[PDB]
């Protein structure tokens, strides 16, 4: 009994199947292309990719009732920590052919998997780089609407600010998935999130904060806006 329907956010689709459960999904921008062994269902001559919240943080955030979702069609996003492109393949679906995605990734063997995908998904520019040194990829990107960060780095906070005060369009959005134990393995999660939010308020206008449980332990997706 597969059935698809629109979702609050443009590009995102809701879908309930056989098991009666409801799931998230997106419109496959490159029909026939699979990125991470995702589940795909044809609605009506069109292909939808089931956005698995267990494989994507952004996914879990949406599933957990995320309020603000800056990533809309035609938007330009600077994705720090693009890795293999699992969750970035969905923002591709969303952002669509008018949207642009500058993906940065430090680990080459990881960034390598995404390269073949961007051939047909010329939506994303896979860039090998280090989010702590934004200059080293200054010639490869342009000011973006949204910055999406998901890096295993203690410096996480400044990274978003550094990259924002260099590539984020003023009055632009920023989404960072923060892992408490990445910043301070000793401190308490709630103690940490309180500081990451403070530090972020010194430059941004923290517009939301959502926990990723039960999908992620001690993780929090923040969304902010550039003054």
């Amino acid at each position: 009994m597969v059935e698809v329907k629109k979702h609050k956010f443009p590009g995102v689709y809701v879908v309930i199947d056989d098991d009666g459960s409801e799931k998230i999904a997106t419109k496959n921008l490159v029909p026939g292309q699979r990125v991470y062994g995702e589940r795909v269902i044809k609605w009506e001559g069109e292909e939808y990719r089931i956005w698995n919240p267990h494989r994507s943080k952004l996914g879990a955030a949406i599933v957990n009732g995320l309020k603000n979702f800056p990533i809309k069609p035609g938007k330009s996003v600077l994705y720090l920590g693009i890795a293999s492109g699992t969750t970035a393949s969905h923002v591709s679906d969303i952002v669509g052919w008018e949207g642009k995605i500058y993906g940065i990734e430090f680990s080459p063997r990881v960034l390598r998997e995404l390269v073949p995908i961007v051939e047909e998904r010329r939506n994303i520019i896979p860039i090998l780089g280090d989010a702590t040194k934004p200059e080293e990829y200054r010639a490869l990107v342009t000011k973006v609407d949204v910055i999406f960060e998901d890096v295993a780095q203690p410096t996480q906070a400044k990274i978003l600010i550094d990259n924002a005060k260099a590539y984020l369009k003023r009055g632009g959005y920023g989404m960072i998935a923060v892992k408490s134990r990445s910043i301070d393995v000793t401190k308490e999660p709630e103690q940490v999130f309180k500081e990451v939010e403070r530090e972020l308020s010194e430059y941004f206008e923290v517009i939301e904060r959502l926990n990723l449980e039960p999908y992620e332990k001690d993780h929090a997706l923040f969304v902010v806006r550039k003054p």
């Binding site: 680990s107 080459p108 200059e135 010639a139 203690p154």
Partner: protein, 350 residues
């Protein structure tokens, strides 16, 4: 003032008005792969020289290592990021590259990434092990031949042996100056010898009890020197490879103990798999048995007294275990967390 984009190097004033652009003259990837890291290239220079002859003495790059190389090249320059130049260049791409500007960024972007990323392989760890083995082998031959060089050239200048105990120097001497009768003060200077040593040498040369060598005798010994010199270059190439390949093979391990030490662990273990299968305890004493524990070369360990060492080696082996695992499965970069933790626990040991 000075910024770059996927097509070339642009120059802007203080008002955001172009001054003089300069498109790359070699493949954009090849050029950017240097300009990005702060290195100066053919095109970047000409663009500067040209701005000079146009009443410009002030320059500001978006990368420090660049401006640093710039000033020591003659151009007084500062460093600001993002500078007015790049801000303009990144705000209105179409204004400089066209309507299909993003498709260009995409082209070079991808090209540059394929350049920088090695292609997939099932044995690159094995390949790193051979390079490390080669490095050791090369060190063994350098010594064997340098000894031969000292013993042979000393038939003609026995005194030089002890005055140039540093092999690279002794090798450069034989290769550069050749016959002991070419010893000036400017050549001994051009080799970078302390003005004091230049004295002990020039002096030992006049009292030299060594045998006479003619042109034929000297040339053969220079051939030997040249070869030791080419062997010193090979060594650098092996190091350079180890460093690059370790990025594909075990980036986490490289970030923790450096590419060479990491490569060494993998070699002692027999492969990255094997390394990932070991427990902290085994990594702690890996490669040694008087020799003990190769991970003891870790700067934090070495600079400490034997009684403060073991504790640290433990903390390290525990981090190496995690790094070896993630490097063997995904390659995901997590060493920064790993490093923070290890650095904090080492401060406790003190």
């Amino acid at each position: 003032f000075i910024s770059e984009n996927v097509r070339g190097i642009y120059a802007f004033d203080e008002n955001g008005n172009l001054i003089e652009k300069r498109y790359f003259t070699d493949k954009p990837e090849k050029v950017l792969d240097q300009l990005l890291k702060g290195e100066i290239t053919k095109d970047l220079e000409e663009l500067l020289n040209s701005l000079k002859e146009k009443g410009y003495d002030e320059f500001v790059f978006e990368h420090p290592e660049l401006s640093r190389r710039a000033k020591e090249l003659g151009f007084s320059a500062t460093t600001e990021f993002p500078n007015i130049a790049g801000e303009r260049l990144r705000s209105n791409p179409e204004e400089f590259l066209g309507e299909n500007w993003f498709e260009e960024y995409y082209k070079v972007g991808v090209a540059l990434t394929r350049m920088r990323i090695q292609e997939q392989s099932g044995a690159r760890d094995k390949m790193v092990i051979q390079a490390i083995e080669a490095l050791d082998d090369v060190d063994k031959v350098i010594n064997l031949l340098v000894a031969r060089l000292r013993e042979w050239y000393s038939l003609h200048f026995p005194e030089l042996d002890e005055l140039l105990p540093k092999h690279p120097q002794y090798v450069a001497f034989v290769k550069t100056v050749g016959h002991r009768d070419n010893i000036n003060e400017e050549v001994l200077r051009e080799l970078g010898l302390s003005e004091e040593k230049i004295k002990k040498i020039l002096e030992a040369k006049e009292k030299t009890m060594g045998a006479w060598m003619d042109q034929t005798d000297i040339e053969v010994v220079r051939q030997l020197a040249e070869e030791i010199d080419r062997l010193y270059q090979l060594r650098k190439k092996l190091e350079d490879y180890i460093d690059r390949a370790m990025d594909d093979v075990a980036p986490n391990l490289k970030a923790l103990v450096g590419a060479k030490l990491a490569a060494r662990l993998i070699s002692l273990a027999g492969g990255l798999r094997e390394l990932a299968m070991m427990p902290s305890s085994t990594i702690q004493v890996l490669g040694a048995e008087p020799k003990h524990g190769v991970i003891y070369q870790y700067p934090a360990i070495n600079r400490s007294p034997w009684w403060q060492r073991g504790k640290i080696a433990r903390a390290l082996a525990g981090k190496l275990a995690i790094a070896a695992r993630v490097d063997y499965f995904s390659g995901e970069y997590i060493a920064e967390e790993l490093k923070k933790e290890l650095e904090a626990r080492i401060r406790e040991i003190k």
